[PDB]
Amino acid sequence: KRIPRKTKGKSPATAEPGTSNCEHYKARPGIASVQKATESAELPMKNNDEGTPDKRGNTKGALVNEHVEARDEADDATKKQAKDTEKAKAQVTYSDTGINNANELSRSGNVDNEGGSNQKPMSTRIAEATSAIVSKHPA
Amino acid sequence: YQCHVCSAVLFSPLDLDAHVASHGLHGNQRHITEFISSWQNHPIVQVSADVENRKTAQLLHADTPRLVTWDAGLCTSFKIVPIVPAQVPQDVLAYTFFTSSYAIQSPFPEAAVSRIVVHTRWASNVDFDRDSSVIMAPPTENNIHLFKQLLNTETLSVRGANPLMFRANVLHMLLEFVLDNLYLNRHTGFSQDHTPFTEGANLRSLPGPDAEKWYSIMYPTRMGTPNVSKICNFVASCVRNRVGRFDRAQMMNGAMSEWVDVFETSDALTVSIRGRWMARLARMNINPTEIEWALTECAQGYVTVTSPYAPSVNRLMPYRISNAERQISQIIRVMNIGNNATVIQPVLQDISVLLQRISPLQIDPTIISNTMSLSPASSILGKLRPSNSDFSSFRVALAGWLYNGVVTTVIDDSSYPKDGGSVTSLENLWDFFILALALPLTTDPCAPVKAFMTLANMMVGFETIPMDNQIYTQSRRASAFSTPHTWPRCFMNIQLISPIDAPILRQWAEIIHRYWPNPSQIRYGTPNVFGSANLFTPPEVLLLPIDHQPANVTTPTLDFTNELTNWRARVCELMKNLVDNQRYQPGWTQSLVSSMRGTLGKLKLIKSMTPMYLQQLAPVELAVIAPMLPFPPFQVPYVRLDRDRVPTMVGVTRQSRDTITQPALSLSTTNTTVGVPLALDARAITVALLSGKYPPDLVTNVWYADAIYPMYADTEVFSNLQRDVITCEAVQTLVTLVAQISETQYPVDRYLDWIPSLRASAATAATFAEWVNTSMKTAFDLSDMLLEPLLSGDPRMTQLAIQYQQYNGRTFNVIPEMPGSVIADCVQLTAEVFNHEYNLFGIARGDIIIGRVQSTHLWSPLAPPPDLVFDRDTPGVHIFGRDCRISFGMNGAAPMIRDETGMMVPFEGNWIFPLALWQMNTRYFNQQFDAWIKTGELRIRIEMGAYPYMLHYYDPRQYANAWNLTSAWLEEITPTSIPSVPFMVPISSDHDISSAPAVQYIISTEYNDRSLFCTNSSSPQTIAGPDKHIPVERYNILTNPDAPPTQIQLPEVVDLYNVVTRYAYETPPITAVVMGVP
Amino acid sequence: LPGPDAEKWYSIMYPTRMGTPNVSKICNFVASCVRNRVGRFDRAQMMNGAMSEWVDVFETSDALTVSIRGRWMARLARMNINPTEIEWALTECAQGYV
Ligand SMILES: [Zn+2]
C-alpha cells in the first residue's frame, strides 16, 4: 500500500433481458476530438520563476535587461503561436502591435531582491564582503 | 454482469465487488473520477498523470496535493535514548508459567543516564512519506547541523553555525516539525491480553511480522514490579485501568469499529497537531448529492448529472472552501503572469480550439463568392480573400472576453488604411468597411473612437471637425487613439459636429452613439459549492461585450432586432449615403454608383448566421466552459461609451492598509493598455462574422449533450480546489513566519525573541521565504507553483489585494479577508511549546560563564549553584561594550582593558562580554586572555541568549580537565560561525565511589538540565552525582488519579502518554451518471 | 564594487567597520566614530522587481569631487525631456502630416 512520491525531498444468474454492447449510436460532436481539445486546454500554467532566488540566495534567470526581456518573450510567444497554427507567419501577433508599449517591464534575473544589479552573484558578494575582515594567527 | 446502481457493465464477480465500493457498497483505487452516460456505451475514467502504461484512460494534468495520508505506527515524536549504559545485579530475572520463562521487558532503557531526544516519526508506518524530518542525534553527538542549513552557504568553518541566524533556523525547524506530523491516525486491529498486570484489556497491534515487541514500549503499566528500582516503583505508582482501548464507535463495519480511543505512548504536541489537522480536513467535507447539484447546475440545463450512493458516515471528500481562498489563488496567478506573453499564449490558443471543437458554427467563405458572382465586387472579393481558411483570430477574439483584466485584444495596425486613407479610393472604402465590421468584437476600450477617427482621417479635405488644441490635427492616425485621455471632445459631445459642414461624419458619429453594441452579463457555475474567484464582479456573473438572448434555431436571418445584424445594416447604409451623390469621389470618370449600391446591398442582405450564433449560443458555451478552466476568468467591467469609467490600470499590493512604505508598483501597471496587448486580423474577423452557418439538421439538445459529456469527464475542478486550499494556507503561514525575523506591521504574539537574530533585509527575507516555500512543496508533493510570484522583491509582506482605477481617478480596491490557517496555528503552538521545552531540541537559554573551577564536587554544570554565577546586580562586576581596547603594561605593570564607563581595569575579577566582542576580536582576545583564564583569576560571562550544546561525560573517580575542550572552542570561534558549547558532566552511580579532582571551565548560568529523563534507572537509588527520578509530571493521566482522561497541560510540559483517537475512512472517487434531457 | 579584486575595498570604503581591539592610533580613531553611518540608508524603489532609481550611501569619498559631480548631474538634469514632450515637438514640427 506504500504510495510512491512524485518529487524528491530530503534524500441461476441467467442473462437478464437488458444488457448488450452493440454500439448503435455515434456522437456528432466527436468524443475523441472533444477529449483531445480538453486535454490541450486542461494543462496548468507555465511557472514564471526568473527573478526569484534559489536556496543559496542567488536569483534565477538570464542577466538581460527588463524591457528587452519583455520584447523577447513577446516575439517568442508570436513564434509559438505561428507554430501552433501551423503556418509561416502568426495571424494573432503579440509583438509589433499598434500600441506603443515602451514602458512595459518583464521580470528578469538582472535585478536582485534589494534593488541592485547582480553582475556578481549574491553568494560571491557575501563571501568577499565577509572575507575582507578575517584574521590569522600571529605566529 | 452489471451494476444496478449506475448501470455499468462488468465481467467478473470480483470486478463487481470492487466496483460497488465506488458507490459505497461493501463485499467480501486507481481511478480519480468515473463517469458514464445513459444514451450510449462509453464510460470515461480518469487516472493520475504520473502513472505508467495507462490502458485508454484520460489523465488528470493538475497538480493536486496529497491531503489525506495515513499513519499506523505510534503517535509519538519524542524518543528516549540511553547515554551511559550499565548492567546491575537483579533479584528477579524472569517469570514462570508451569514450565515457561518470560523475560522481563522494561518500557525504558536500563542505563545509568538516559535523556529525551527528538526523532520525528521514529516509530510509525506510513503510506506516503512527506519527507521533512527533524532527526536529532543524542546530545553526546554533535547536532550543529540542525542550525546551519538555511543562511550558511559561505562559512569560515564546517562545524560552526552563525549566531545571527539562530531564530531563522529554529523557525524553519519548527515549520518542518509541524509539517512532518500532518498525517492521519489509522485503525489497525487489537488483541486481548491476560497477563496478570494487564488483564482483559484490548491492546493495539502494529502492522508487520512482529507485534509483541511493541507491547513493552506502548504500555508501561504492563511490566509488573518484580524488582526494587526506579522503573519498578514508578510502575507501582501508576494506576492500572488506563490501558489499551478506551471506547469505540457504535457504527461497526463487519465486526470492526469505525474509530476508537486508546491509551498508549504518544505526546500531547503531536496529538494536538494531528487533531487540528483532522478538524481542518473534516471542515472541508462534501456530499455526493451536492456534487450532483453542482455539476447539473454548471451544465446550464442541457444535461442532468446524478450520483447515487449508500448511507455512510465515514466517507471523506474534502472539497469545500471559501471564496477568500479562491480569490487569493487568483491574485497569485495574476502576479505569476507578470507581463510574460508566453504564459498567456497557450491559454488563449487552447480555449480557442476548444470553442472551435464544441461549437455548432461552421465558417465557409464560399457564401460570399456565391452572393457576389474597377468592378467593386471583384475588389472586395480580392480584399476579403475568401480562399484563405484560417479563422483563429475570430475564436481568439471570443476567448479573450474572459480575460479582460490581463490581456486586451486590439485590431492589428496593418488593417488600417495605408497612409491614413482617402474617401476618393475604392480600396480605402473597402478597408473601412472591413475595419468597422470587425471593431465591435474586440475588448479594447477605445474601439468606438478608433472606428470614428478612421473615417475622420479619411474625410480630410472634404469635411472638418473642431480641434482641441494647436498640436494635433484631424489627420492623426486612428490607431494612435489607445487611451481614454485621447477621445475628442467633438466625438464625446455629439452636437459639436455641425451637420451643414460634416454631414456624413456626424451621421457616422450618431450611428456609433446609438447602435454600438450594449454590454450584458450572464451567470455561470455553481457559487454554492464551487465558490467563485471573481474579484471585481459579483460571485456568479460573466460579463460580455454584447447582448445575449435565449436560444432558438427558428429565428429569421434578417432580424434587425439583433445588435450585430443592425450594426452591419447601419454601416452599409452609411457607406451607401457616402457613395450616393459622388460628392466625395471626383476623378471617377465612369459612374460606379449602381455597382457600389448593388454590392453594399448584397453585403447587407447576406444570409450569415454568425450574428445569431454570437447572440444566442456563444454565451451559453462560455458559461459551460468557464467553471472548468484551470485559470478562471479575470474580468474588468465593460463600459460602452462612458469615458470616466474606462479602466486604465491594474495593480497588486502586498503591504497592509495602515502603513506607508516604498511605493512598489506591480509590473502589471506598466502596460499602456489595461492588459498585455495582442493584435487581431480585422479581415479574418469580418469574413468569419459575415459567412457562417449551422448544420442542416442541428438538434440543440443532442448537440450540446454530446459536446458536454466528454469534457466534463476530464474535469479537474476538485484538484484545483484542493490546490487553492494549499495556496491560501501557504500564503498565511509565510506571512506569519516572515513577520518573526524582521520588522513588519503584522503582529502575531512574538513567542520567541530570546533566540538572537538580525533584522533581515529584503534579500535575507526572500531567501528565507524560499526555504519555507520549498519545504512546503516537498511536504505536500507539489512541483508546479506555490508562492513563487511573492518572492520577487521584498517578500516582507502583510496581505494581498488587487485594485484597478477608472479614468477619473476613482479606484476600486479588493481585499480578501483571509481566514485562519491550520499550519500557521500549529506552528505558533509548537513555538509556544518550544518556549518551555527548548532543552529537548538541543538548545539552552541564557549564557555561559568561562572560569576555572577545581574541586571534588559533583553538581552537573548544566545546573549551577548560586555561588559561581554573577550578573549586573553583582557588585564588583565590569560590563564591557564594543569599545574595548587593550593596552600592554610597561616595565612590570599589568595590561588593561577598556571598561564601558571609560576606566581601565587589569585582567582580574568578573567580566561580562557580549558574544559579539569575542566573535569580532577572536584571534587577538584569545592570545591576550588564554593564560589568565587558564591559571589566573579571570572569569568571563559571555552572554548569548541561545546556544547549542554538546555533552562530554566522564568518570567522577579519576582526574579530568576541561581545558583541552574549552581552548578548542575558544580557538574555533570565528566572526561568522560558532561551534556547539562543550560541557563536561560527571556520571551518576547507584553505589558510593571515591572522589578525584576535576578542573572544568565552562558552566551555564541557569537550569538547562531538562532533557535528562532518569539516572540509574535499574537501581534502587542514586548515591553520587545528578539524581533524577522518573518525571511523573509527564505521566499525568496515569499517576494523577483525579485527572480527566483528556487533560493536557500542553504549553508548559508535554505529556508522553495520552489518549489517541484512531480512524478508518474511505475516500471514494467522483462518480456521476450523465443523463440526457429531451 | 565591480572588479577583479573586490576583497580589498570593503576595508578602504568603510573605516568604522573594523574592530578596535587596540590602543593604537587607528583604533583610537575608530572608537570615536558613530556606528549607524555605514552603507546605504535611503533608496527610491518606484517599481517592484526593478533597479532602485537612486541611493544614498556613506562611503569613503571626497567632498570636492562629490560637489563637482553634483553640479554636473544638476546641469544634465536641467536638460532632461520626456517622451510626451518629444512627441508634441515632433508632431508640431511635422504639422500633422506625421
Ligand atoms: Zn456501479
Distance CA B332, CA B731 (A): 10
Ligand 1 geometric centre to CA of B250 (Å): 28
Q: Pick from B150, B148, B324, B19: which is nearest to B769 by CA?
A: B150
Count other Cβ atoms within 10 Å, centred on residue A24.
7
Do the annotations mark residue B19 as ligand-binding? yes
Chain breaks in chain A (C to N over 2.5 A) after: 11
Q: Where are the beta strands (DSSP E) in B155-196?
A: 184-185, 190-191, 194-195
Handedness of CA B927, B928, B929, B934 (dihedral sign): positive
Residues of A in contact with B392 (CB under 8 A): 85, 91-92
The C-alpha atoms of residue B641 and residue B645 are separated, in whole angstroms, by: 9
- Give every CB contact of residue B291 below 8 A, 6+ residues apart in sequence: B307, B317, B529, B1070, B1072
Strands B79-85 and B111-117: what pairing?
A: antiparallel
What is residue B246's three-state secondary structure? strand
In the stretch 52-71 of chain A, residues with CB closer than 8 A to chain C read 66
Q: How near does any CA of chain C get to the CA of A118, in Å?
A: 10
User: What angle do the packed helices B822-837 and B717-738 form, to 10 degrees?
Assistant: 40
Q: How far is CA B373 from the centre of its chain?
A: 62
DSSP assignment string, B404-449:
TTTEEEEE-STTSPGGG--TT-HHHHHHHHHHHHHGGGS--TTHHH
Chain A with chain C: Cβ pairs closer than 8 A: 36
Query: CA of C90: which chain B residue's CA is closest?
Result: B471
How many A from CA of B309 to the centre of ligand 1? Answer: 10
Q: Grid coordinates in use for B570?
A: 447601419
Query: Do B1017 and B110 contact (CB within 8 A), yes or no?
Result: yes
Secondary structure class of B146 (helix, strand, coil) = helix
Query: What experiment produced this structure?
Result: cryo-EM
Return the number of other C-beta atoms located less than 10 Å from residue B356's C-beta: 18
Which of B470, B653, B662 is most worth mutating to test chain C (most C CB atoms within 10 A of its CB)? B662
Chain A neighbors of C8, CB-CB under 8 A: 132
Which of B662, B792, B885 faces C22 most closely, judged by CB atoms?
B885
d(CA B581, CA B11): 81
Copy the grid coordinates of residue B569.
Answer: 445594416
| CA neighbor of A59 nearest in space, from A68, A47, A67, A50 | A50
Task: Give the mutation candidate from C29, C48, C92, C97 for the B interface (greatest B CB count, under 10 A).
Answer: C48
Q: Find where cell 538581460 sits.
A: A64
Q: Are B740 and B750 in contact (CB under 8 A)?
A: yes
Ligand 1 center from residue A37 Cα (angstroms): 28
For residue B16, the CA-to-ligand 1 centroid distance in Å is 8
Distance, CA of B421 to CA of B417 (rounded, Å)? 5
Q: Decide if C42 touches B, using CB distance below 8 A.
A: no
Q: Is B260 annotated as a binding residue?
A: no
Q: Tell me the CA–centroid distance for residue B300 and ligand 1, in Å.
A: 26
Q: Would you call B199 helix, strand, or coil by DSSP? A: strand
Cβ-defined contact of A114 to B762 (cutoff 8 Å): yes
Is B836 assigned to a binding site? Answer: no
Closest-CA residue of C relative to A131 is C7
B81 annotated among ligand-binding-site residues = no
- Measure the N-to-C terminal CA separation of chain C; round to a whole number of Å: 47
Determine contact: A84 vs chain B, CB below 8 A: yes
Alpha carbon of A117: minimum distance to chain C alpha carbons (Å): 7
Which residue of chain B has the CA closest to A18? B2
Asked if residues B434 and B682 have their Cβ atoms less than 8 Å apart, the reply is yes
Helix, strand and coil in chain A, % to nearest 5: 30, 5, 65
Instruction: Select from B991, B875, B739 the least CA-distant residue to B112.
Output: B991
Q: Which chains touch B (3 or more CB pairs under 8 A)?
A: A, C
Q: Residue B21 C-alpha to ligand 1 middle, in angstroms?
A: 8
Nearest to residue A7, comparing CAs of B129, B150, B215? B129
Q: How far apart, in whole angstroms, are the C-alpha atoms of residue B855 and residue B870?
A: 19
Chain A positions in Cβ-Cβ contact with residue C42 (cut-off 8 Å): none
Contact status, residue A63 vs residue A118, Cβ threshold 8 Å? yes
Give the chains touching A; criterion: ≥3 Cβ pairs < 8 Å.
B, C
Give the full edge-to-edge strand order of the sheet including B801-805.
B649-653, B801-805, B811-814
* B75 annotated ligand-binding residue: no
Q: At what angle do helices B563-580 and B426-438 cross, to 10 degrees?
A: 160
* Residues B929, B930, B933, B935, Cα dihedral to 10°: -130
Beta strands in B64-212 (DSSP E): 70-71, 79-85, 94-96, 101-103, 111-117, 184-185, 190-191, 194-195, 198-199, 203-204
**Nearest residue of A to residue B680 by CA position?**
A92
Q: What are phi and psi of B510, to 5 degrees?
A: -65, -40
Say whether B112 sits in a helix, a strand or coil.
strand
- Strands C39-43 and B44-48 turn out to be unpaired
Contact B475 C49 (CB under 8 A): no
Within 95-124 of A, beta carbons closer than 8 Å to B belong to: 95-101, 103-107, 111-115, 122-123
Count Cβ–Cβ pairs < 8 Å, chain B vs chain C.
Answer: 59
**B719 neighbors B62 (Cβ within 8 angstroms):** yes
SS3 (DSSP) at B837 = helix
Could you tell me the distance, in angstroms and rounded to a whole number, from the CA of residue B142 to the centre of ligand 1? 59
**A-to-B residue pairs, Cβ atoms closer than 8 angstroms:** 285
B667 in contact with C, Cβ within 8 Å: yes
- Contact across the interface for C18 and A107, Cβ inside 8 Å: no
User: How close does chain B come to A33, measured CA to CA in Å?
Assistant: 7
Residue B666, helix vs strand vs coil: coil
Distance from the B666 Cα atom to the nearest Cα atom in chain C, whole angstroms = 6
Distance CA B737, CA B768 (A): 10
Task: Inspect the interface and report whether the beta carbons of A34 and B341 lie closer than 8 Å.
Answer: no
Task: Say how many Å lie between the first and final Cα of chain B, rounded.
Answer: 29
Q: Check C22 against B886: CB less than 8 A apart.
A: yes
Long-range contacts at B46-55 (CB < 8 A, ≥ 24 apart): B46/B713, B46/B714, B50/A6
Cβ atoms of B733 and B649 within 8 Å: the answer is no
Q: Would an 8 Å CB–CB cutoff place A134 in contact with chain C?
A: no
User: CA-to-CA distance for B474 and B459, rounded, in angstroms?
Assistant: 9
Rounded Cα distance between B232 and B670, Å, is 75
Measured in whole angstroms, how far is the alpha carbon of residue B89 from the centre of its chain?
Answer: 58
Interior CA angle at B883 toward B882 and B885, to 5°?
A: 125
- B-chain CB neighbours of A77 within 8 Å are 341-342, 344-345
Residues forming beta bridges with residue B264, ordered by sequence position: B1058
**Ramachandran assignment for B1061, one of left (phi > 0), alpha (psi -120 to 50 degrees), beta (any other):** beta
Nearest to B271 by CA among B71, B67, B51: B71
Cβ distance A66 to C50 less than 8 Å, yes or no, reads yes
**Which among B351, B452, B485, B326 is positioned nearest to B409, based on CA atoms?**
B351
